[PDB]
């Protein structure tokens, strides 16, 4: 049914192909598990779970999942996921090709992401992996959040929250944090913490305060600082408790209004 075509992109887990649905005549994105990882149960499982978790979401700002299955290739069974096709670019790409967005644009985009996440949080779903690569902007400039993660067991990493690097409990406020990180990098052109390993970056995430955005990049403002740093506060209790709260504050900043976030001085 699906005539696959060009490679749209590469992820740490999969190859995503543009394809044509020949029964409905629409372009779709087909996510195919990396050949070599299919043999590892943990990954096959992860892949399938994410699929079923994401199909439970239906919002204009969230990439819809349409179908599943497994191609019975000569090598073995490659599971794949059929989804709504976004013709556009991830924020990572945007940052890598065009530099930091204008404050207002950043605000608009992140605010849309908030709606996606809030809708999700309401149908009881933590994303878990909010990062620049998991948010796309369409040719027609719609924001689209994707690659929703899944509750895992217990005994990148550059946008994970503190409670994630420790083995603590995870809820909506962690999406709030990591989103904070996205906004940060998208305002300044850099992720808030960098280093020579995951470990050290994990250290920074839970130990060192971020440099205020206005202090890493020109024409930002103290109010943005406020919002960004409240989003990136270490203890979930001191952050925006909900996506909507964060969004409301972003809206305040977008207009000429002062945000409710505690103030930040340089
Ligand atoms: N719905 C889509 N429409 C168009 N391109 C897409 C779409 N989904 C993914 N891509 C592209 O293919 C990519 C990877 O998709 P992912 O779902 O993030 O794969 P992944 O294996 O989960 O990567 P991770 O985050 O390392 S596990 C890019 O970041 C894209 O440019
Ligand atoms: Mn993924």
UniProtKB/Swiss-Prot annotation:
Induction profile: Transcribed at highest levels in early log-phase, decreases as cells grow older.
UniProt binding sites for ATP: 8-16, 31
Positions of the Protein kinase domain: 2-251
Compartment(s): Cell membrane
Active-site residue numbers: 129 (proton acceptor)
Modifications made to the protein after synthesis: Autophosphorylates.
Known function: A serine/threonine-protein kinase, acts on HupB in vitro. Protein kinase that regulates many aspects of mycobacterial physiology, and is critical for growth in vitro and survival of the pathogen in the host. Is a key component of a signal transduction pathway that regulates cell growth, cell shape and cell division. Also catalyzes the phosphorylation of the core proteasome alpha-subunit (PrcA), and thereby regulates the proteolytic activity of the proteasome.
Subunit: Homodimer.
UniProt record similarity statement: Belongs to the protein kinase superfamily. Ser/Thr protein kinase family.
Protein name: Serine/threonine-protein kinase PknB
Organism: Mycobacterium tuberculosis (strain ATCC 25177 / H37Ra)
Gene: pknB
């Amino acid at each position: 049914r699906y005539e696959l075509g060009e490679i749209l992109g590469f992820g740490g887990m999969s190859e995503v192909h543009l394809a044509r649905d020949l029964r409905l005549h629409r372009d779709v994105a087909v996510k195919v598990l990396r050949a070599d990882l299919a043999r590892d149960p943990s990954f096959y499982l992860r892949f399938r779970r994410e699929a079923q978790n994401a199909a439970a979401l239906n919002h204009p700002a969230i990439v819809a999942v349409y179908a599943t299955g497994e191609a019975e290739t000569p090598a073995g069974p490659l599971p794949y996921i059929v989804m709504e096709y976004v013709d556009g670019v991830t924020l990572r790409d945007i940052v890598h090709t065009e530099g930091p967005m204008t404050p207002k644009r950043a605000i608009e985009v992140i605010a849309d992401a908030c709606q996606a996440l809030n809708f999700s949080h309401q149908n009881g779903i933590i994303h878990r992996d909010v990062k620049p690569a998991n948010i796309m902007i369409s040719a027609t400039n719609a924001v689209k959040v994707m690659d929703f993660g899944i509750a895992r067991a217990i005994a990148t990493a550059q946008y994970l929250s503190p409670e994630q690097a420790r083995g603590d409990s995870v809820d909506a406020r962690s999406d709030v944090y990591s989103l904070g990180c996205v906004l940060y990098e998208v305002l300044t052109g850099e992720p808030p913490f960098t280093g020579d390993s995951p470990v050290s970056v994990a250290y920074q995430h839970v130990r060192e305060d971020p440099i205020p955005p206005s202090a890493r990049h020109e024409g930002l403002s103290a109010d943005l600082d406020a919002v960004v740093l409240k989003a990136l506060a270490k203890n979930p209790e001191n952050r925006y408790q909900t996506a909507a709260e964060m969004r409301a504050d972003l809206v305040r900043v977008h207009n000429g209004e002062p945000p409710e976030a505690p103030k930040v001085l340089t």
